[model samples]
Target: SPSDFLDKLMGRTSGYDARIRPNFKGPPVNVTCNIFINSFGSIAETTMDYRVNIFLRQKWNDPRLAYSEYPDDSLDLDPSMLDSIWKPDLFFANEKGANFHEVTTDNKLLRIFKNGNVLYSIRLTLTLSCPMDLKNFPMDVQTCIMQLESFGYTMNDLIFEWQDEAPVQVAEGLTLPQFLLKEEKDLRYCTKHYNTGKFTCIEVRFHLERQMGYYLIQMYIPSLLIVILSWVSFWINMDAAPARVALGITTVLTMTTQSSGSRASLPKVSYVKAIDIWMAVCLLFVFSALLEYAAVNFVSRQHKVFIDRAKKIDTISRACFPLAFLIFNIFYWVIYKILR
Candidate 1:
């Protein structure tokens, strides 16, 4: 019984060679691949990488393995037989870390059909690099990609492609703290031709839309409340210069602290982010509130003791500060959230 598999593999003239490609001197073999994502873990902005758990399945045909002796349509071959068969030398080009699942046993499967078609599946956890463009910052959408290619084999030897059905299957309960996932049809098959030959490759892309609830709670709401707090200085009497000045300056610095800490999770890139624009506007409003006090002070001290003029300036600012902030909010939301 043991010799039967041995004879099927090696009967001299009809023996299978692990060293050579399946169809050694014929056309290129087609390997159809698919991904079943279980959980898409952390997508780190600082590290610019994402971790994922997925079952990578592939199918290919080799006429040499055909056997009609099996009762079922397919044979659940042992893992040992994989060493004696030809497999495509595919590798993930952009993976930072990778591991095979083997909790109870080796989490892998290899099945061969009566027609010599083989199906192989393995559960893998991969940490992959995903560069992010944070120009929009909190309201940003990121596109991360996974690249798989043949290491040594060229297009003339083998070709990698997507499965006929859903090539990318994402878990229905897939939820990320920072993002929402998209795209089951983002498979891209490519061939790179150079001086040597063509290298076969395929890529999968994920479009992740960021969630804004965290930013609204952590950054936006606090800064907006501080803006309203600074407005309190406008209503204070002109004689109470100490209270007005202290309130104005304190709110200005508080806005400064808010903006600085907002960028703690981001890189120091030389481009404007939506959060940057928001902080700048809020700081400008608070600073202007302080400058209004200076203007009112100038009217009282320099303009011939005119308390009436200072009263008018204070009255105008009480209405103008909130109105100006309202206008800025209208434009800011329309440009960043609505326009894009």
Candidate 2:
């Protein structure tokens, strides 16, 4: 019976002509999508590569294509066989510089139901660009957007909407070494009217937060240790001028070098980053240590009263330097954390 039904369905000719545009009557086509991120790359370049599963469905009003006139309620057909059928030409609006690569095998489906409804499914990968803000640098959260719209159809003919639930989903095991997914949002809007028509669009936004552990170990800890090393000169006897001076200059230069190396990997931006503030403050602390020794060394060549004052200053600085650094850190973190 099933074989007979299949043969009857294939043999029976439907009066519907896919080539005719207005044969199905006027009703807006509905499109929905689900995206799963496979991998993430290039915050500097502002690009991301991801996978998408798209679902497109539309209804035809011709009675000849209805289930009552056919042996079965549905038919599976090759996509190529339906070239004459009306289909939406969808494209990504936020794609980077019109550069995208599709990675899909030969798994595509086109299904036509006997009730005059059509459904199509496809899977593809895309690389899209997203604008980034780096005011917070490694501690920042970046939001990337993927926008889809019909290239030729107007909002009146094609309305893009998301599914009621699970419209956007991520891979269960997806992991990025430097970032984690923080939030997602779905939005719909209409494009400005062109000569042809206004287009309806849908977008999905992904919010990713950078992980701080890597930078903490590689940059922050070393910087903190180097600043502490410069403090060692405070305890060194003023007579040991060469060793103390060398320590101060060495730490200062090392910090400069470290700051340069860290910034080299990021894009040149006009605004100062949080890390910049940290490096500048650390350099100031190291330079202050050197300046303290200079004052002490200078006064040692003066009269006895001045020399006694210099010794008193050195005694006071030994405690004041570290305490000042601690206070600076508290203020720095409190302000930046609030801003973030």
Candidate 3:
């Protein structure tokens, strides 16, 4: 049984000594992975530049040596195991250590504490050697890459002591591995930076993920409202200039409001986004106002008998407007789906 194995490895009398040590506690270990963007202008040319921070707190009774406290059993087991546990995981194999000069000796773990906070902050700065690209890639793809890098901390294998506020606190759902975040304006100029610079730099941030109903509603509602408001243009009378003007202006203002509100939650992107597509659809709704005005004015300019006949044609043309709008929207959406 599992108990039998534990009984032999740890003292047979009481397993509690090995399994749980009530008084043992240590500082958190911060593991930062800095990813350096390597660029050489030519394809295949590379260099390294950015950094990501990963933090790990020490667990109770951990065999690893500490910066403040020395090892208790230096000669009890294999020296290699001692090295493995005591050193930062960044120093371990398959992790990024040699990229930074050398982690020659164990140093005192440092913590930065704010005046108002109770828990100490342990920060690790890891320099990475990876290419950072924002151009020609979709925003969600860019976000996913960063998410992979943020959650890469599990590989470190350190015992994490749990607390309400532990050693590490990544922003909710923001952790990603080998990922980077670039602001919208920065994305516009990203291609230029990558092409001209010796080394490209991308900044990354972390946040925890939680499903909030309000957030989902906030994202969905504006799109729905814009779509609904655009449809109102169909009800406006083509003969009345004020009616057409009111419908166009109201939808325009509504679209602007919806765009501004939604943009607030999202990262400003250099190129068009899904939200942009939705706004374009709303704009198309306003286009109907202009088309209607042209038809009505054309009929007004003709003589009385001709005007009456033209009115009949205009009524038929106006009747077809909604169908045309629906077809155009569907065609555009299909194209966006294929292209995107």
Best candidate (score: lDDT): 1
Model 2: residue 45 alpha-carbon error in angstroms: 4.3
Tens digit of per-residue lDDT, candidate 1, span 260-309: 89876687787888898898888888878888889898888873439888
Report the Cα lDDT for residue 174, model 2. Answer: 62
Candidate 2: clashing pairs of residues: none
Report the C-alpha lDDT of model 3 over 1-340, residue by residue, as the tens digit.
5345323333334333423222234343333323222221111113323344444233223332222222322212221222212233223211233232225543223221222111221334444344434232222232211211112123223222224332223344453343333332111111112333322122333221223345337644665565556555445544566765665667667666766775554444466665566556656655554555566667666644766665666666557766876786687657644754
TM-score of each prediction: 0.93, 0.84, 0.39
lDDT of the structure predicted as candidate 1: 0.83
What lDDT score belongs to each candidate, Candidate 1 first?
Answer: 0.83, 0.69, 0.40
Q: Per-residue lDDT for 188-300 in model 2, tens only?
A: 56464668777887777778788889989988999999999988987887888789878877998999898888877667788999888898888888888888888888888
Give the higher-TM-score candidate: 2 or 3: 2
Give the range where candidate 3 is weakest over 10 consecutive residues by summed lDDT.
Answer: 184-193
Give candidate 3 misplaced runs (Cα > 4 Å). 1-139, 142-244, 260-269, 301-303, 309-317, 331-339
Candidate order by TM-score, highest to lowest?
A: 1, 2, 3
Regions of candidate 1 where Cα sits further than 4 Å from its true position: 6-14, 303-305
Candidate 3 structure, TM-score to reference: 0.39
Which 10-residue span in candidate 2 carries the lowest summed lDDT? 51-60
Candidate 1's TM-score reads 0.93
